[PDB]
Amino acid sequence: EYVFESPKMKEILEKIKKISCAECPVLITGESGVGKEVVARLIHKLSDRSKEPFVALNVASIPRDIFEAELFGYEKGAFTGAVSSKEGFFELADGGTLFLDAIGELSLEAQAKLLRVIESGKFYRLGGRKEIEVNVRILAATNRNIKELVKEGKFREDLYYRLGVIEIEIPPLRERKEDIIPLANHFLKKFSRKYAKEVEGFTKSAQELLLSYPWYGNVRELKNVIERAVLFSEGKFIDRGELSCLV
Amino acid sequence: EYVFESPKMKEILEKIKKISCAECPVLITGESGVGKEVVARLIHKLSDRSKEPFVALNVASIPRDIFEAELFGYEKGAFTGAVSSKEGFFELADGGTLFLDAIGELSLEAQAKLLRVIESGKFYRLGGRKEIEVNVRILAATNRNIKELVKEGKFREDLYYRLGVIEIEIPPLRERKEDIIPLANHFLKKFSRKYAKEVEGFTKSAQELLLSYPWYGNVRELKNVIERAVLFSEGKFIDRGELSCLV
Amino acid sequence: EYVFESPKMKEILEKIKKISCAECPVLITGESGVGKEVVARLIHKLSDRSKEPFVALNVASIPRDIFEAELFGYEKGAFTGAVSSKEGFFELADGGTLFLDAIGELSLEAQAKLLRVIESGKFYRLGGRKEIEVNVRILAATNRNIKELVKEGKFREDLYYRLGVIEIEIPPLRERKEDIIPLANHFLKKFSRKYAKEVEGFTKSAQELLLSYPWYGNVRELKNVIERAVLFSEGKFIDRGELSCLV
Amino acid sequence: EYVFESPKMKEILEKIKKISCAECPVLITGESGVGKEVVARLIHKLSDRSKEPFVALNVASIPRDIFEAELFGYEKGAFTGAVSSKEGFFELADGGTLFLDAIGELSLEAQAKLLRVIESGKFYRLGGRKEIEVNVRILAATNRNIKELVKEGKFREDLYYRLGVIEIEIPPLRERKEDIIPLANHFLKKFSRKYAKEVEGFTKSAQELLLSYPWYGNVRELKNVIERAVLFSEGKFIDRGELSCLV
Amino acid sequence: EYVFESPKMKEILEKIKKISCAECPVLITGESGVGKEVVARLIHKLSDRSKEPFVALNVASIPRDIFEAELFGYEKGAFTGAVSSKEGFFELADGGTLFLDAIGELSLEAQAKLLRVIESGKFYRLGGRKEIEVNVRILAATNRNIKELVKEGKFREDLYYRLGVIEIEIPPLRERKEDIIPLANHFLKKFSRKYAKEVEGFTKSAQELLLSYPWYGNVRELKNVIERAVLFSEGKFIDRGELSCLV
Amino acid sequence: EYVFESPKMKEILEKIKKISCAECPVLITGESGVGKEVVARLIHKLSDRSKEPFVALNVASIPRDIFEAELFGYEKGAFTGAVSSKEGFFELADGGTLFLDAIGELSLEAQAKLLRVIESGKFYRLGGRKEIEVNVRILAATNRNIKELVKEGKFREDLYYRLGVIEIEIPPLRERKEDIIPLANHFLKKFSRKYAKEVEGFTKSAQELLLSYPWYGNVRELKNVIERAVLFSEGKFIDRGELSCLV
Amino acid sequence: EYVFESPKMKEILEKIKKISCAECPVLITGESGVGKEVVARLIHKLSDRSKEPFVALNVASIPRDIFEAELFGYEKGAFTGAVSSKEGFFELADGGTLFLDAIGELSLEAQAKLLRVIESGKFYRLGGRKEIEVNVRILAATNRNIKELVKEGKFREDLYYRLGVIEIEIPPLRERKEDIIPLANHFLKKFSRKYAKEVEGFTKSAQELLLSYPWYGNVRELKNVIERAVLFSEGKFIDRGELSCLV
Ligand SMILES: Nc1ncnc2c1ncn2[C@@H]1O[C@H](COP(=O)(O)OP(=O)(O)OP(=O)(O)O)[C@@H](O)[C@H]1O
Ligand SMILES: Nc1ncnc2c1ncn2[C@@H]1O[C@H](COP(=O)(O)OP(=O)(O)OP(=O)(O)O)[C@@H](O)[C@H]1O
Ligand SMILES: Nc1ncnc2c1ncn2[C@@H]1O[C@H](COP(=O)(O)OP(=O)(O)OP(=O)(O)O)[C@@H](O)[C@H]1O
Ligand SMILES: Nc1ncnc2c1ncn2[C@@H]1O[C@H](COP(=O)(O)OP(=O)(O)OP(=O)(O)O)[C@@H](O)[C@H]1O
Ligand SMILES: Nc1ncnc2c1ncn2[C@@H]1O[C@H](COP(=O)(O)OP(=O)(O)OP(=O)(O)O)[C@@H](O)[C@H]1O
Ligand SMILES: Nc1ncnc2c1ncn2[C@@H]1O[C@H](COP(=O)(O)OP(=O)(O)OP(=O)(O)O)[C@@H](O)[C@H]1O
Ligand SMILES: Nc1ncnc2c1ncn2[C@@H]1O[C@H](COP(=O)(O)OP(=O)(O)OP(=O)(O)O)[C@@H](O)[C@H]1O
Ligand SMILES: [Mg+2]
Ligand SMILES: [Mg+2]
Ligand SMILES: [Mg+2]
Ligand SMILES: [Mg+2]
Ligand SMILES: [Mg+2]
Ligand SMILES: [Mg+2]
Ligand SMILES: [Mg+2]
């Protein structure tokens, strides 16, 4: 039930299928709403770990003072407010997939702490003296210009080459015009069913509008606009007027 | 007992009715006193959750160091040394409605923490390793210029497109002149009853004054001025003089 | 035993009487010593809560890290604080009157925390998950130029319209010259009795002095000057010389 | 055994006597060593509380984080640490006299915390919910230019009018030349006795020196110089030479 | 299964062999992806400690407040949060090899704490009063310009002469063109086997491309590009086109 | 066994003797090595407390957060490491002598805390509510220009006049040339005995050198130079050559 | 097995012998690698304490908040000072030698804390009220320009004259050319034995190189270069070529 029609999206879909047999890190980039999370979850579903956990994590929103504790866990003992050991998210995802979302907003301090784990699967728990080993497939996404961040020294070169073994750059909706109408149709069908309405399609006038609008919020903005059009619709068809007052 | 008379307010009232069957996030904006909270509680009352809790929260006033704990709760254990787990507000609102007030004053740090929850309904408790899932309808309001905040990078683009699926921008009272007199009348009736007074209406002169005053505090300022007029009134009618010394 | 003689003070006294039947927030402003606390306590005495507690609070002097704890209390559990729950000042004033003094010096951070309570009477305790409801009549006073603070963004517009439902702006003594002599006389009587002296009144020369002095400390400065004059007095009358060396 | 000979010191002594029957706050100012503490303790001795405690406190040297605890005490509970309640200095001085020394060096933050207590005698303990009432006579002293501090906003106007009900401004020794010789004589007698020496007085030459020296340390500097002259003296008289090498 | 073909790499391999009998510190430098960790682990495998532990540590990512505790351990007692003593990483590596990675990013404060240990093998535990002695072979790597850091005072001269007894500076891939094709071939073989593909080699056109590309991520970037080429490949050979759209 | 030969040192020695019967504060100043501690301990030995404790304290090196605790002690309660009360140094020196070394380097914050104790001998323990009284003779020294510090406001005028009742300003060695040779001789005798050497005196040439050298470290530098000369000496006499290579 | 051949090194060796009978502080300075630690341990071995402990301490690398605790220890009680008392390093070295390394990097705050101990051997434990006395011989070393630090006020004059009773300034290798060849020979012998190689000496060409190279890392750099030359050597002799590619 996902839409891939434009040339680039079709290529992307192909790459996703071709890496099914692999477990190497994938770095997914693009503007807000272009479908990075959809692609990450799809890569997971088509992979050899489809039946293992998919642990999602906004890695930049974790406060700096608990970063290690949260990713690597901590050992019962001195570096403590605690009685017993606690698994971090790397262990929680052992044998599965760990999705580092907002990777490009991570602090330099935190990027450095992630460095050795990505390739070796090994780390010490906060306060522990036993190397722990996990087998985790890494996915990462960001809507930041990550190549620019590397150039400006805001993102570590050595972490970039570890994460971006496979690189999927999803283009903005406005450069995938072939996706627009099929996407709009897909949502119109979904919402019309969901809200028990009699909308069926768009006038030719409305379709022109959909194709010329920039979609700064990309697929998510499109989905929102169709969800509005359906809820406020009267006819069997959505006309240019109904859209124009929604964008 | 709410007043909607001007064209825009009537449209707004219609949108409110048309989204009764839906559960999508609503983003309510406008100057102080224009009725954002009234609109939020109305949306609730007309919705499929009217009978479930309506949890209000000034989300920007929560101190940064307890933000997660308060929204997501915390697990008994070593991240802070409490004894037992505690529900956050998302859980407390499960099956109901969560109203994020002052959303536009939220810090960038805190906006990022809210990001994944809005669409997936999933999060980890502070210190926990079990994904929790809730089904919460989100409403948000702010008297800040939220589109400008996005342009200036003071508010995340990706959070904006998640929150503003339905957008209700309530205009200032001074651009809804058709509401002014019915509002004043509504308050005059309410307070005259409440304080056992004999006031019945306004002179034609007073009404002109009400229509030309800017109402920088909008509906709330209007309500205050009428409450004063009634308490200090003598006649059966409020004349321009009694108002002029109140504004 | 309070003096209200000038036109404006007489109007103010009237407003105070006319709001006896009401419970709406009153915002009292004016220079140091003009009688803001007298007015606040008078409003209380003439109100329907005269027999309930009158909780005074310099709200701006509460340190920021305990603001919530102090106003809203805290739940047992809930952050290192403690074994058991503790009422905040809002609860302590339930059914009574809560006087927020120095309201205009409150920090922006703290103003925002007060926002929802003023109109809804509802809040959560620090660390609690049960909405608490109280019925508190709010009075507030400040010697700061609060309208200017709003214009400069130093004080929230939305809190100002919540607090200033009724607005009493008490003028400086120097613009209430009709109050000066009756005030001086009132104090002369009070202190002459208190310190067992034989002073009875002021010469005509002294009275001129009292009327032309600016009284930058207003009623309080006046009261101090008379208290001095009585303690250091010899005659049955206070002459210009005895005052001139006191101002 | 205190010396008051110059006109201003004689006036001051009179004011002290005339306020014996009173309990109003006294604000004592002047350069270092002019006798502020002597005046404060004298006011106490001649007052109706001569037999009650005289609690001295360098109020500006109390660290900001314990200011409330120290002045107002704290209730058991009160954010852990303590088991039981503790009286502050206001309570310790109940029925007595509380001498706030270095009042002019107090931080703005701390001045504000003292505000309501001065006139109402009421306050809450840190963490407490019971208003406490005490009956304390306040004295305050500073060697700072307190009127300038008010003008520059470094000292609150509203606290100044509360403290300075009676104002005693003690002049520097260099503007009280009539006090110099009697003071020097008084110390000469005191130390000559104390150190078993045969000094009796000063030559006419030495006296001229004493009168022309600025005395930047005021009475204290004078006392120090005489204490030196006596210890190092040989004759029955102190000559200009013995002084000149001491100043 | 490691590739050393270019002149400099062959020299480096020789040095590695010639130091097998030694235990002196080795300082390995070069751009990201040039093989510093491979060289460090190789030195270990060929050394007299091949069978002892190889403890890897990103020494610059350890937070400053726990640096000592982590390297030197801590004694049970004060400087606490603890009940019992804990070995640091120096002890954990006793008799083995300790690999200080990112040595050039270490803070000056931390560099100073490492100083005496490097040559003497002796240190006190945090809070301990017994000198501990260990026999640890030190390796260190960094992708920072470490000679420049010394010149700029960002890295201690005295630590530099302690660490760089043997200095291996690994050149970028772009200055080891003799390594490029054998490396590409090595990876092609490895991945073709791993992903069960029929790729065997590169066209002459592809090989030209590989030799002229800068390889800013060095061997790691090369390995990534080959891994892509194999996963997306169709033929038995990879042509220039398949590479060009990968670089 | 102390040397006082120059005119000023002889005067100083006389002052010391003349104050034996007194207990007033002495403020001792001068460059590093001129003998401030020698003078302080001498004043003690010749005083009426020679047999009571001499408590030395580098008062400026005490960290600010424990200043009160260390000088005034703390009451059980307060709530830190504590179960029981602890004497501060003022109490430990009760009946004895308290030597405040480096007084000129004390922070303004700390100077203020010392203020009331110096003359009244009274203070409260940290956290205590009982005034404690001690009888302590105060000595103070510093190598800072204390009169300049007062002028620049870096040192309180009111503390200066309390400390400097008796003032001993010890001149640099270079302005006490009469002391140089006897001092050198005194050390030569001391060290020659101590290290079993045959040195007896200095050549005329060496003595000229000793008299013309500035002695920036004053008596201590001189003592060091003689200690070297004796240890490295061969003859019965130290010649100019042996000194010249030591200065 | 230490080499002292040049004139200055021979003088230094002599001073070391001549101070065997003494216990006075020695201040050892010079560039990195010139042998300061060798000289300090030699002074110890030849001294009357050769058989007592030699406690080495990088005094500048101790964190400021534990400086006292570490040097002077702490008393049980004493701010959750743990349960029991703990000796500091001064006590641990009682009767022995305490070597303060990196003395010139010590903070002004910390230098002041060391001041009184150096000459009096007396101090209080953190939190203690019993003067402790120890008999410790002090050695100190630094590679910082300590005389310049005194002039710039970065190092206390009064501590400098306490530490530098005996001053050994070890010159750079480049100003001790007579030491170079014997040093190189000494190392060649040592390493040739250690690594079972057949190297015996240097060609005349190599020796010229050794003498003209600046040796910025001094004896340590030389030792490193010889250790490399021996490990990578083939002949019985090291020629200029083998060195030139090593420097
Ligand atoms: N190809 C697609 N077909 C159908 N639905 C899609 C497609 N791409 C995106 N969507 C929908 O659009 C919305 C945004 O997708 P997604 O959450 O993956 O965006 P994103 O690029 O991760 O955005 P952000 O940067 O804001 O996190 C989701 O509702 C997703 O289900
Ligand atoms: N349409 C309406 N009819 C009657 N009363 C109204 C209406 N809109 C608002 N009010 C009244 O005006 C007051 C302010 O409205 P509300 O609190 O909803 O404003 P707001 O936009 O949330 O303002 P703020 O941003 O300052 O919180 C309330 O007392 C509300 O009951
Ligand atoms: N109208 C009045 N009649 C008699 N006494 C008065 C009057 N107004 C004020 N006073 C006396 O003057 C003094 C100051 O009054 P009050 O403390 O209420 O002033 P305020 O405006 O609250 O001052 P501040 O801003 O300094 O807190 C008090 O002693 C009060 O009792
Ligand atoms: N009128 C007086 N007669 C006799 N002795 C006096 C007189 N005034 C002051 N002294 C003595 O001179 C000294 C001045 O002390 P006092 O503490 O009263 O001055 P102060 O103004 O409080 O100084 P500071 O600002 O330094 O605290 C004291 O020793 C006091 O006993
Ligand atoms: N000579 C070689 N032969 C085969 N594979 C190599 C060689 N050198 C490096 N690699 C491979 O390429 C990558 C080189 O990474 P390595 O960690 O050794 O580089 P690095 O310089 O330490 O990188 P960084 O500075 O980014 O940590 C690893 O996958 C390694 O396996
Ligand atoms: N008059 C003297 N006769 C003999 N020895 C002296 C004399 N004065 C000082 N010394 C010696 O010189 C050394 C330094 O003197 P002291 O420690 O008292 O100086 P200081 O002024 O306190 O120096 P700093 O400012 O460095 O503390 C001591 O060893 C002391 O014994
Ligand atoms: N005279 C000597 N004979 C033989 N070896 C020496 C000599 N001097 C120094 N070395 C060797 O040179 C190396 C550095 O010496 P040392 O550590 O004492 O120098 P340092 O001045 O303390 O250096 P840093 O300032 O870097 O601490 C050591 O291995 C030492 O053994
Ligand atoms: Mg996403
Ligand atoms: Mg609202
Ligand atoms: Mg007031
Ligand atoms: Mg005083
Ligand atoms: Mg590496
Ligand atoms: Mg000293
Ligand atoms: Mg060293």
TrEMBL record, chains A, B, C, D, E, F, G:
Binding site for ADP 4: V3, G33, G35, K36, E37, V38, R220
Binding site for Mg(2+) 3: D101, A102
GO molecular function annotations of the record: ATP binding; cis-regulatory region sequence-specific DNA binding; DNA-binding transcription activator activity; identical protein binding; metal ion binding
Keyword annotations from UniProtKB, A to Z: Activator, ATP-binding, Cytoplasm, DNA-binding, Metal-binding, Nucleotide-binding, Phosphoprotein, Transcription, Transcription regulation, Two-component regulatory system
Domain Sigma-54 factor interaction: 2-231
Subcellular location(s) per record: Cytoplasm
Residues engaged in binding ADP 2: V3, G33, V34, G35, K36, E37, V38, R220
BP GO annotations: phosphorelay signal transduction system; positive regulation of DNA-templated transcription
Residue sites binding ATP per the record: V3, S32, G33, V34, G35, K36, E37, V38, N143, R162, R220, K223
Record keyword Transcription regulation present: yes
Binding site for ADP 5: S32, G33, K36, E37, R220
Keyword field contains Transcription regulation: yes
Residues where Mg(2+) 2 binds: E37, D101
Major place of residence: cytoplasm
Residues noted as binding ADP 3 in the record, renumbered to the chain: V3, G33, G35, K36, E37, V38, R220
Binding site residues for ADP 1: Y2, V3, G33, V34, G35, K36, E37, V38, R220, K223
GO CC, one annotated term: cytoplasm
Cysteines paired by S-S bonds: C21-C24
Record protein name field: Transcriptional regulator (NtrC family)
